[PDB]
Amino acid sequence: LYWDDLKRKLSEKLDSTDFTSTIKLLNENSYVPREAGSQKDENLALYVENEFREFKLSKVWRDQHFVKIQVKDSAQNSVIIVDKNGRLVYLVENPGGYVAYSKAATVTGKLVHANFGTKKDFEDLYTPVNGSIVIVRAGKITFAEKVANAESLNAIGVLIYMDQTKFPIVNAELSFFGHAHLGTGDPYTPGFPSFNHTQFPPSRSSGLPNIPVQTISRAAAEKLFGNMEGDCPSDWKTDSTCRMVTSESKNVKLTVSNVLKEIKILNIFGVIKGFVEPDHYVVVGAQRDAWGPGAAKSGVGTALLLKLAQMFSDMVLKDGFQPSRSIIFASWSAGDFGSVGATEWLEGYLSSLHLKAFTYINLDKAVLGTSNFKVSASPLLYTLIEKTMQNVKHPVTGQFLYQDSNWASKVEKLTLDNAAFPFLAYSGIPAVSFCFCEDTDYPYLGTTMDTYKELIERIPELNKVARAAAEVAGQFVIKLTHDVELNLDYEEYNSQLLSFVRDLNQYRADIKEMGLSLQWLYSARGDFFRATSRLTTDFGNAEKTDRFVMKKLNDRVMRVEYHFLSPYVSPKESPFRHVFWGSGSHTLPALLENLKLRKQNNGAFNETLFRNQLALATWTIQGAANALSGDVWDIDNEF
Amino acid sequence: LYWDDLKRKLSEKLDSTDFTSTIKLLNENSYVPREAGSQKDENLALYVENEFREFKLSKVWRDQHFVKIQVKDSAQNSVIIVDKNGRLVYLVENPGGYVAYSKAATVTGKLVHANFGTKKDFEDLYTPVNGSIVIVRAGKITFAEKVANAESLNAIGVLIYMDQTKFPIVNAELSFFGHAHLGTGDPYTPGFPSFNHTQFPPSRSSGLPNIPVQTISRAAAEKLFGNMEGDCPSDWKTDSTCRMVTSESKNVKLTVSNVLKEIKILNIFGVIKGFVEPDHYVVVGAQRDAWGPGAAKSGVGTALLLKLAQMFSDMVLKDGFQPSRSIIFASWSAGDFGSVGATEWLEGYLSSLHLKAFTYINLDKAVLGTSNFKVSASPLLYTLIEKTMQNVKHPVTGQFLYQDSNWASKVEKLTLDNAAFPFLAYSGIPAVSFCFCEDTDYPYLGTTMDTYKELIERIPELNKVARAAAEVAGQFVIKLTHDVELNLDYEEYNSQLLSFVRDLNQYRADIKEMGLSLQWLYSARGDFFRATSRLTTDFGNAEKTDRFVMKKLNDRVMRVEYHFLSPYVSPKESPFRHVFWGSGSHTLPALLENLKLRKQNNGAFNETLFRNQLALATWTIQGAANALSGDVWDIDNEF
């Protein structure tokens, strides 16, 4: 069949599927407080597992794991205003939720209020946090980062609350759940999978806070500010009520008693064998666990995952759809703690997954509104996102998703808090991640309010919306399989690489003060350009009939993304090796970021570090070239 | 054509090729003191380059490199006996040769004599070297190691001499050239290629001595012993004359003044495109540089490389030989400094070479005698070495190389001083390395006596011998190409892996005192066994006609070797990642080696280190499995 056929079919199938029902079903008390590694969790897990079997799809299995999660200890966590003694005031609050992996301790002192988790940026404010508890709004960044910065400035204890402007929740007595891990997955098995607790049981601090972090209810926040002299700025796009510092007369004490708890995570798979490259998959994932009922955080996703798996299998058996490459749906777990489920899976194929999975889609938080349509992905999927947004019509507006007034669409970078991030920044798998987002992030998200009710009360046509999301997700899959040529934009990296070279030339002056020639970099960038030009050529000259010559090419394409992972840094030390989207000194952006400091004439610039950064970042790119072909044995022997 | 045909052809071609002539030609003053990066060097380089062109073989190019080599400074290096003041006797000697990368310094003190470069083992002798110069025989290990150990015991300065028993050289006034780098290639570009000196110019100590090392003439050794009280043991399979310690009355002073010198290494390639898998090569290398005339150290090799390249090209054009996979001959340079030439090439494809080169043969020191036939390689080439030694007849004895009385032949491990070692321990390419060796190593080897004359004066039928070497090398190539199935013994690793598990079970007691379950290891070992069993099956069921299904399999085979390189250690830190043949704490052998210390009840055993060693070494193997198939997504979801 041809695209139109698959497009048309997939549509009518989408035209007759009740997503709202399943989003509800995944709310019955049978599996509501489906916390990570809970019974409910395990319940839905087996539900999905069976549904897959019922869907009559090919092989479907389970993925067991024992990771250390953190939970609220029998002892109550609390915030209390008190002086250099005598715990005055009422018990401000015994928080209902908590920030996982938070430092298990209790301390007291001054209480500064650094708008939006310091943002690392916001820390450049008047009042110093040098040895004092800090308050921050849940927003621009992740708790992990909020805390991280707080501690980088020598603070202690951090409280996170949902202000009224940012979080228009009627109830101010509401509490939410936190993370706090500056990473992805179990914080004790970095790069390599976990075992038992009995075996390999380190405690923590392996990229974990070391500073108590507690989520606080707006109501509680109110009271805190009540005992603060300072006055909240207008710079902060907020609204009245908050202060900046507690009234000298007295301070506050934070006491968090949480405990680690080894749980058994259960990832559930299920594939749809392909017909020509049966061993090249398209991983389609969806977080299945959640703190509250997480109808949004986890419902819609798993909802789509199921309904989406139900369709393709059907299309394959009844409609004649013959995916040239297999599809593999996966419902991760323990996701509220850093994709711990999906990550430790990846941790499992540390150097071969890219030889298997060529693209990772992600349905998490797919439906949260009806205004915008944010999209984050690897440039390799840029043209797919584009051409697809040109085929899918908004659920509310009768118009197409793609803004016809541009030629350059907006694509966002993947964040530390997205199951897709690990797939791309750690496993080297290109990954997309769409969202029918809103200018303001869903409020009930990390709280017990993520009910199917308050959701649909806030998004009436949730069915049509989810449908659209399930459509863009569907086309991605049909597209990434329908044809014999693996369609990934390995070109977009030429651009991505040139942009780097450019931004780097803005320091050609600094580069000159230092003996650096910066010539080897251009060579790589070029030695790589040719590589892509050949591939881009060989394809054209090859026939979509020589299963052999095509396979040899698609494999090269399939190498592109992975090979941009610094082969000079250990996963055990710095898991996000991707020079472009990773995190670490190996990061390409990190290079410039250090060089920028050169001008500051201070010591902030580590020259020896740069020297290497450049040196390796060069060979990384170079290698990416020699690996992406050049007909092997690249013969630019001159230079 | 069929094997017999190729075997028969290759033979008559070998029957009519004068190897002795070329071994001589590569001795004319046109290129005699062909030191690394010298003019002569560059002369022969262009000779080979052109010869290849003349051979009418396909593409042939050059490989430029700028590495830092160490040379003898204008100031004379010397050893002199002197009391707690001034030289009483005489300046023992002003050594004619030197040990490269040796610490540039000068010190004096006591002089102990630890037979055979301490061997690391021999250091467990009576007299302590705690702060004193040491003497050692050139033998069982490499200078690098000899020195390394000396310094690990806090010694200073090391003298290396060629005793009479081990080195039956008539002349005792003879001096030889050394190495001293505990690694491979330029000691400042570990894992990543080098540049200019102007750019990236660190000094050293990046895996280098830090202790002066000087080669000494037997004559000089005589004199040293002359001023020593101690008496040489019989344990030392040596002969009279040497002492153990200098006569208390006085000590010795070592002064080495060497300087670094950036040179331009020139690797010369040349391939023979294949007909079905044109992009899968069989790298055939041969060191081209040498200190002295190195007729043995470098002559025979390059001699073979050329003559051997001359044949296959001919066979392809005239005889109809259609190698299914391309062959690529390479004459490295700067090899006397740790394969600096070949290594920095590999350094260049840090994560893709294995996708290209599937086996590395090495012709260095191929002919050194006519008694034995030592052979070192990766178990993956075990059956090839075997079946071939069953086809090649000894040059002297009319009988076949293979000892018909056994079913298990002897294969040696690759040493830090063999260009083949890096290919296997760093790039993950299986590599063989034969030698028509002798019970005693060639004496003139590292000295100005490595002439084509003294060679042929010591090996009369050098032609026939070289021919044989050229034959086993030839068959390896024909064999690794002739057929469509990539013939590598990926099974032999099951054994190699079981042997580990076995040796490890001898400590099940220790493993028990520690909470360790050691169960995950067996799973890996097994999860891998199946992997091979499928591959070993899929092959049989596939037809040597489906270029596609075969290519998909051969590629899996081609992954086997590489995937045993710890993906948890950085090449920049520990270049030899191969868990089996590498060097480092990631090494499988290194694991047991630490565990053995457990019983010693002392602190010598680092428990935290072990815990990880095992933990990772497990996932390394595990991964090797998940990468070698299991039909992808290995479904041993239970456990």
PDB file of all heavy atoms in Angstrom, chain B residues 593-618:
ATOM      1  N   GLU B 593      43.104 -11.549  39.841  1.00  0.00           N
ATOM      2  CA  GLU B 593      44.365 -11.089  40.402  1.00  0.00           C
ATOM      3  C   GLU B 593      44.214 -10.234  41.656  1.00  0.00           C
ATOM      4  O   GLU B 593      45.135 -10.142  42.456  1.00  0.00           O
ATOM      5  CB  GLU B 593      45.156 -10.324  39.337  1.00  0.00           C
ATOM      6  CG  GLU B 593      46.669 -10.315  39.559  1.00  0.00           C
ATOM      7  CD  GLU B 593      47.255 -11.717  39.743  1.00  0.00           C
ATOM      8  OE1 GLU B 593      47.096 -12.291  40.843  1.00  0.00           O
ATOM      9  OE2 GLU B 593      47.867 -12.248  38.784  1.00  0.00           O
ATOM     10  N   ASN B 594      43.061  -9.598  41.821  1.00  0.00           N
ATOM     11  CA  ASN B 594      42.820  -8.776  43.003  1.00  0.00           C
ATOM     12  C   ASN B 594      42.207  -9.683  44.054  1.00  0.00           C
ATOM     13  O   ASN B 594      42.586  -9.641  45.223  1.00  0.00           O
ATOM     14  CB  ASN B 594      41.857  -7.634  42.674  1.00  0.00           C
ATOM     15  CG  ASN B 594      41.575  -6.740  43.866  1.00  0.00           C
ATOM     16  OD1 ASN B 594      42.492  -6.332  44.575  1.00  0.00           O
ATOM     17  ND2 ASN B 594      40.304  -6.417  44.082  1.00  0.00           N
ATOM     18  N   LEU B 595      41.269 -10.520  43.619  1.00  0.00           N
ATOM     19  CA  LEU B 595      40.586 -11.451  44.507  1.00  0.00           C
ATOM     20  C   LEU B 595      41.544 -12.419  45.169  1.00  0.00           C
ATOM     21  O   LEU B 595      41.325 -12.816  46.305  1.00  0.00           O
ATOM     22  CB  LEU B 595      39.535 -12.248  43.746  1.00  0.00           C
ATOM     23  CG  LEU B 595      38.487 -12.919  44.629  1.00  0.00           C
ATOM     24  CD1 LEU B 595      37.641 -11.853  45.317  1.00  0.00           C
ATOM     25  CD2 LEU B 595      37.597 -13.798  43.779  1.00  0.00           C
ATOM     26  N   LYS B 596      42.598 -12.814  44.459  1.00  0.00           N
ATOM     27  CA  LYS B 596      43.577 -13.735  45.028  1.00  0.00           C
ATOM     28  C   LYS B 596      44.111 -13.161  46.337  1.00  0.00           C
ATOM     29  O   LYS B 596      44.382 -13.898  47.289  1.00  0.00           O
ATOM     30  CB  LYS B 596      44.759 -13.946  44.076  1.00  0.00           C
ATOM     31  CG  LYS B 596      44.454 -14.680  42.776  1.00  0.00           C
ATOM     32  CD  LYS B 596      45.756 -14.996  42.033  1.00  0.00           C
ATOM     33  CE  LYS B 596      45.528 -15.476  40.600  1.00  0.00           C
ATOM     34  NZ  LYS B 596      44.793 -16.769  40.508  1.00  0.00           N
ATOM     35  N   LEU B 597      44.245 -11.836  46.376  1.00  0.00           N
ATOM     36  CA  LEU B 597      44.759 -11.130  47.545  1.00  0.00           C
ATOM     37  C   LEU B 597      43.856 -11.210  48.783  1.00  0.00           C
ATOM     38  O   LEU B 597      44.303 -10.980  49.909  1.00  0.00           O
ATOM     39  CB  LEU B 597      45.004  -9.666  47.179  1.00  0.00           C
ATOM     40  CG  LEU B 597      45.853  -9.420  45.930  1.00  0.00           C
ATOM     41  CD1 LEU B 597      46.064  -7.924  45.758  1.00  0.00           C
ATOM     42  CD2 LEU B 597      47.198 -10.139  46.050  1.00  0.00           C
ATOM     43  N   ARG B 598      42.588 -11.530  48.565  1.00  0.00           N
ATOM     44  CA  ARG B 598      41.615 -11.643  49.646  1.00  0.00           C
ATOM     45  C   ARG B 598      42.121 -12.555  50.753  1.00  0.00           C
ATOM     46  O   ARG B 598      42.097 -12.188  51.930  1.00  0.00           O
ATOM     47  CB  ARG B 598      40.300 -12.190  49.091  1.00  0.00           C
ATOM     48  CG  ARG B 598      39.143 -12.224  50.069  1.00  0.00           C
ATOM     49  CD  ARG B 598      38.878 -10.858  50.665  1.00  0.00           C
ATOM     50  NE  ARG B 598      37.474 -10.648  51.007  1.00  0.00           N
ATOM     51  CZ  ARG B 598      36.724 -11.516  51.672  1.00  0.00           C
ATOM     52  NH1 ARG B 598      37.231 -12.674  52.071  1.00  0.00           N
ATOM     53  NH2 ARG B 598      35.462 -11.218  51.953  1.00  0.00           N
ATOM     54  N   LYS B 599      42.581 -13.741  50.360  1.00  0.00           N
ATOM     55  CA  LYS B 599      43.098 -14.746  51.289  1.00  0.00           C
ATOM     56  C   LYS B 599      44.276 -14.273  52.148  1.00  0.00           C
ATOM     57  O   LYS B 599      44.422 -14.705  53.298  1.00  0.00           O
ATOM     58  CB  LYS B 599      43.522 -15.999  50.517  1.00  0.00           C
ATOM     59  CG  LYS B 599      42.397 -16.676  49.750  1.00  0.00           C
ATOM     60  CD  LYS B 599      42.901 -17.912  49.001  1.00  0.00           C
ATOM     61  CE  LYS B 599      41.775 -18.618  48.240  1.00  0.00           C
ATOM     62  NZ  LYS B 599      42.269 -19.766  47.414  1.00  0.00           N
ATOM     63  N   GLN B 600      45.119 -13.405  51.585  1.00  0.00           N
ATOM     64  CA  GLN B 600      46.285 -12.872  52.291  1.00  0.00           C
ATOM     65  C   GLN B 600      45.928 -12.118  53.577  1.00  0.00           C
ATOM     66  O   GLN B 600      46.817 -11.605  54.268  1.00  0.00           O
ATOM     67  CB  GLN B 600      47.088 -11.950  51.365  1.00  0.00           C
ATOM     68  CG  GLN B 600      48.075 -12.673  50.457  1.00  0.00           C
ATOM     69  CD  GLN B 600      48.811 -11.732  49.507  1.00  0.00           C
ATOM     70  OE1 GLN B 600      49.295 -10.669  49.909  1.00  0.00           O
ATOM     71  NE2 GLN B 600      48.910 -12.129  48.242  1.00  0.00           N
ATOM     72  N   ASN B 601      44.629 -12.061  53.879  1.00  0.00           N
ATOM     73  CA  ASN B 601      44.077 -11.399  55.066  1.00  0.00           C
ATOM     74  C   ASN B 601      44.556  -9.968  55.325  1.00  0.00           C
ATOM     75  O   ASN B 601      44.091  -9.321  56.267  1.00  0.00           O
ATOM     76  CB  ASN B 601      44.311 -12.258  56.326  1.00  0.00           C
ATOM     77  CG  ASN B 601      45.790 -12.394  56.695  1.00  0.00           C
ATOM     78  OD1 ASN B 601      46.482 -11.397  56.930  1.00  0.00           O
ATOM     79  ND2 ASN B 601      46.273 -13.635  56.754  1.00  0.00           N
ATOM     80  N   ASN B 602      45.473  -9.473  54.497  1.00  0.00           N
ATOM     81  CA  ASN B 602      45.988  -8.112  54.650  1.00  0.00           C
ATOM     82  C   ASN B 602      45.084  -7.129  53.897  1.00  0.00           C
ATOM     83  O   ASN B 602      44.016  -7.506  53.398  1.00  0.00           O
ATOM     84  CB  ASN B 602      47.428  -8.016  54.127  1.00  0.00           C
ATOM     85  CG  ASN B 602      47.548  -8.375  52.645  1.00  0.00           C
ATOM     86  OD1 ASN B 602      48.643  -8.338  52.078  1.00  0.00           O
ATOM     87  ND2 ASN B 602      46.425  -8.725  52.014  1.00  0.00           N
ATOM     88  N   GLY B 603      45.516  -5.874  53.809  1.00  0.00           N
ATOM     89  CA  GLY B 603      44.715  -4.875  53.122  1.00  0.00           C
ATOM     90  C   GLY B 603      44.928  -4.834  51.622  1.00  0.00           C
ATOM     91  O   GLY B 603      44.226  -4.101  50.918  1.00  0.00           O
ATOM     92  N   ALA B 604      45.886  -5.620  51.134  1.00  0.00           N
ATOM     93  CA  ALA B 604      46.210  -5.675  49.712  1.00  0.00           C
ATOM     94  C   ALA B 604      44.975  -5.787  48.819  1.00  0.00           C
ATOM     95  O   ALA B 604      44.991  -5.344  47.667  1.00  0.00           O
ATOM     96  CB  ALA B 604      47.149  -6.838  49.447  1.00  0.00           C
ATOM     97  N   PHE B 605      43.911  -6.378  49.355  1.00  0.00           N
ATOM     98  CA  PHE B 605      42.659  -6.547  48.617  1.00  0.00           C
ATOM     99  C   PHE B 605      41.738  -5.330  48.759  1.00  0.00           C
ATOM    100  O   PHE B 605      41.315  -4.986  49.865  1.00  0.00           O
ATOM    101  CB  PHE B 605      41.935  -7.805  49.116  1.00  0.00           C
ATOM    102  CG  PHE B 605      40.543  -7.987  48.554  1.00  0.00           C
ATOM    103  CD1 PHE B 605      40.345  -8.294  47.208  1.00  0.00           C
ATOM    104  CD2 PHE B 605      39.425  -7.885  49.379  1.00  0.00           C
ATOM    105  CE1 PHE B 605      39.056  -8.502  46.702  1.00  0.00           C
ATOM    106  CE2 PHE B 605      38.135  -8.090  48.879  1.00  0.00           C
ATOM    107  CZ  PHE B 605      37.953  -8.401  47.541  1.00  0.00           C
ATOM    108  N   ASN B 606      41.441  -4.674  47.642  1.00  0.00           N
ATOM    109  CA  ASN B 606      40.546  -3.523  47.656  1.00  0.00           C
ATOM    110  C   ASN B 606      39.172  -4.107  47.382  1.00  0.00           C
ATOM    111  O   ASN B 606      38.884  -4.510  46.258  1.00  0.00           O
ATOM    112  CB  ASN B 606      40.911  -2.526  46.548  1.00  0.00           C
ATOM    113  CG  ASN B 606      40.031  -1.276  46.565  1.00  0.00           C
ATOM    114  OD1 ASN B 606      38.851  -1.340  46.920  1.00  0.00           O
ATOM    115  ND2 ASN B 606      40.598  -0.142  46.162  1.00  0.00           N
ATOM    116  N   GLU B 607      38.329  -4.168  48.407  1.00  0.00           N
ATOM    117  CA  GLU B 607      36.996  -4.734  48.246  1.00  0.00           C
ATOM    118  C   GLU B 607      36.089  -3.907  47.345  1.00  0.00           C
ATOM    119  O   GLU B 607      35.423  -4.457  46.464  1.00  0.00           O
ATOM    120  CB  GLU B 607      36.323  -4.929  49.608  1.00  0.00           C
ATOM    121  CG  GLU B 607      34.958  -5.607  49.519  1.00  0.00           C
ATOM    122  CD  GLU B 607      34.440  -6.089  50.866  1.00  0.00           C
ATOM    123  OE1 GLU B 607      35.135  -6.899  51.520  1.00  0.00           O
ATOM    124  OE2 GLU B 607      33.337  -5.666  51.270  1.00  0.00           O
ATOM    125  N   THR B 608      36.056  -2.595  47.556  1.00  0.00           N
ATOM    126  CA  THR B 608      35.207  -1.741  46.734  1.00  0.00           C
ATOM    127  C   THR B 608      35.586  -1.895  45.268  1.00  0.00           C
ATOM    128  O   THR B 608      34.715  -1.898  44.399  1.00  0.00           O
ATOM    129  CB  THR B 608      35.327  -0.264  47.133  1.00  0.00           C
ATOM    130  OG1 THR B 608      35.222  -0.141  48.556  1.00  0.00           O
ATOM    131  CG2 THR B 608      34.200   0.535  46.496  1.00  0.00           C
ATOM    132  N   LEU B 609      36.883  -2.026  44.999  1.00  0.00           N
ATOM    133  CA  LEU B 609      37.357  -2.203  43.635  1.00  0.00           C
ATOM    134  C   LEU B 609      36.792  -3.495  43.066  1.00  0.00           C
ATOM    135  O   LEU B 609      36.208  -3.497  41.979  1.00  0.00           O
ATOM    136  CB  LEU B 609      38.883  -2.251  43.601  1.00  0.00           C
ATOM    137  CG  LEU B 609      39.515  -2.700  42.281  1.00  0.00           C
ATOM    138  CD1 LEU B 609      38.920  -1.915  41.131  1.00  0.00           C
ATOM    139  CD2 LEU B 609      41.021  -2.507  42.343  1.00  0.00           C
ATOM    140  N   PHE B 610      36.961  -4.595  43.797  1.00  0.00           N
ATOM    141  CA  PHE B 610      36.440  -5.880  43.345  1.00  0.00           C
ATOM    142  C   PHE B 610      34.962  -5.730  43.013  1.00  0.00           C
ATOM    143  O   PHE B 610      34.558  -5.872  41.857  1.00  0.00           O
ATOM    144  CB  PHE B 610      36.600  -6.943  44.429  1.00  0.00           C
ATOM    145  CG  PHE B 610      36.086  -8.301  44.026  1.00  0.00           C
ATOM    146  CD1 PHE B 610      36.786  -9.085  43.116  1.00  0.00           C
ATOM    147  CD2 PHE B 610      34.895  -8.790  44.546  1.00  0.00           C
ATOM    148  CE1 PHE B 610      36.313 -10.325  42.733  1.00  0.00           C
ATOM    149  CE2 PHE B 610      34.420 -10.028  44.164  1.00  0.00           C
ATOM    150  CZ  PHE B 610      35.131 -10.796  43.255  1.00  0.00           C
ATOM    151  N   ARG B 611      34.162  -5.442  44.034  1.00  0.00           N
ATOM    152  CA  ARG B 611      32.727  -5.257  43.861  1.00  0.00           C
ATOM    153  C   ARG B 611      32.376  -4.697  42.485  1.00  0.00           C
ATOM    154  O   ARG B 611      31.509  -5.235  41.795  1.00  0.00           O
ATOM    155  CB  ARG B 611      32.186  -4.323  44.947  1.00  0.00           C
ATOM    156  CG  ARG B 611      31.871  -5.014  46.256  1.00  0.00           C
ATOM    157  CD  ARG B 611      30.377  -5.253  46.392  1.00  0.00           C
ATOM    158  NE  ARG B 611      30.071  -6.179  47.479  1.00  0.00           N
ATOM    159  CZ  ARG B 611      30.556  -6.078  48.713  1.00  0.00           C
ATOM    160  NH1 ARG B 611      31.379  -5.090  49.029  1.00  0.00           N
ATOM    161  NH2 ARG B 611      30.213  -6.972  49.628  1.00  0.00           N
ATOM    162  N   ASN B 612      33.050  -3.620  42.090  1.00  0.00           N
ATOM    163  CA  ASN B 612      32.796  -3.017  40.789  1.00  0.00           C
ATOM    164  C   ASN B 612      33.337  -3.928  39.700  1.00  0.00           C
ATOM    165  O   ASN B 612      32.595  -4.331  38.799  1.00  0.00           O
ATOM    166  CB  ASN B 612      33.456  -1.639  40.674  1.00  0.00           C
ATOM    167  CG  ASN B 612      32.855  -0.618  41.619  1.00  0.00           C
ATOM    168  OD1 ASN B 612      31.633  -0.522  41.767  1.00  0.00           O
ATOM    169  ND2 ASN B 612      33.713   0.168  42.253  1.00  0.00           N
ATOM    170  N   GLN B 613      34.623  -4.251  39.787  1.00  0.00           N
ATOM    171  CA  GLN B 613      35.251  -5.116  38.798  1.00  0.00           C
ATOM    172  C   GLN B 613      34.282  -6.207  38.383  1.00  0.00           C
ATOM    173  O   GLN B 613      33.963  -6.358  37.207  1.00  0.00           O
ATOM    174  CB  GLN B 613      36.519  -5.747  39.362  1.00  0.00           C
ATOM    175  CG  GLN B 613      37.671  -4.787  39.480  1.00  0.00           C
ATOM    176  CD  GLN B 613      38.858  -5.378  40.220  1.00  0.00           C
ATOM    177  OE1 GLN B 613      38.790  -5.643  41.425  1.00  0.00           O
ATOM    178  NE2 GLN B 613      39.952  -5.590  39.502  1.00  0.00           N
ATOM    179  N   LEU B 614      33.800  -6.963  39.357  1.00  0.00           N
ATOM    180  CA  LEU B 614      32.863  -8.026  39.065  1.00  0.00           C
ATOM    181  C   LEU B 614      31.622  -7.408  38.430  1.00  0.00           C
ATOM    182  O   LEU B 614      31.273  -7.723  37.301  1.00  0.00           O
ATOM    183  CB  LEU B 614      32.507  -8.760  40.357  1.00  0.00           C
ATOM    184  CG  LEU B 614      31.615  -9.996  40.305  1.00  0.00           C
ATOM    185  CD1 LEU B 614      31.660 -10.678  41.657  1.00  0.00           C
ATOM    186  CD2 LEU B 614      30.185  -9.614  39.952  1.00  0.00           C
ATOM    187  N   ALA B 615      30.973  -6.509  39.154  1.00  0.00           N
ATOM    188  CA  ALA B 615      29.765  -5.862  38.670  1.00  0.00           C
ATOM    189  C   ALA B 615      29.829  -5.468  37.201  1.00  0.00           C
ATOM    190  O   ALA B 615      28.979  -5.871  36.406  1.00  0.00           O
ATOM    191  CB  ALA B 615      29.465  -4.642  39.516  1.00  0.00           C
ATOM    192  N   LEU B 616      30.828  -4.675  36.841  1.00  0.00           N
ATOM    193  CA  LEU B 616      30.952  -4.241  35.460  1.00  0.00           C
ATOM    194  C   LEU B 616      31.361  -5.395  34.540  1.00  0.00           C
ATOM    195  O   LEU B 616      30.692  -5.672  33.541  1.00  0.00           O
ATOM    196  CB  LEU B 616      31.943  -3.077  35.374  1.00  0.00           C
ATOM    197  CG  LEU B 616      31.467  -1.813  36.101  1.00  0.00           C
ATOM    198  CD1 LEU B 616      32.561  -0.778  36.102  1.00  0.00           C
ATOM    199  CD2 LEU B 616      30.231  -1.256  35.420  1.00  0.00           C
ATOM    200  N   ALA B 617      32.446  -6.081  34.887  1.00  0.00           N
ATOM    201  CA  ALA B 617      32.914  -7.208  34.087  1.00  0.00           C
ATOM    202  C   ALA B 617      31.743  -8.118  33.725  1.00  0.00           C
ATOM    203  O   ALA B 617      31.789  -8.856  32.739  1.00  0.00           O
ATOM    204  CB  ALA B 617      33.966  -7.999  34.859  1.00  0.00           C
ATOM    205  N   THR B 618      30.694  -8.064  34.539  1.00  0.00           N
ATOM    206  CA  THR B 618      29.517  -8.867  34.306  1.00  0.00           C
ATOM    207  C   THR B 618      28.751  -8.224  33.179  1.00  0.00           C
ATOM    208  O   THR B 618      28.537  -8.836  32.138  1.00  0.00           O
ATOM    209  CB  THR B 618      28.612  -8.926  35.543  1.00  0.00           C
ATOM    210  OG1 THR B 618      29.310  -9.556  36.617  1.00  0.00           O
ATOM    211  CG2 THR B 618      27.378  -9.746  35.251  1.00  0.00           C
TER     212      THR B 618
END
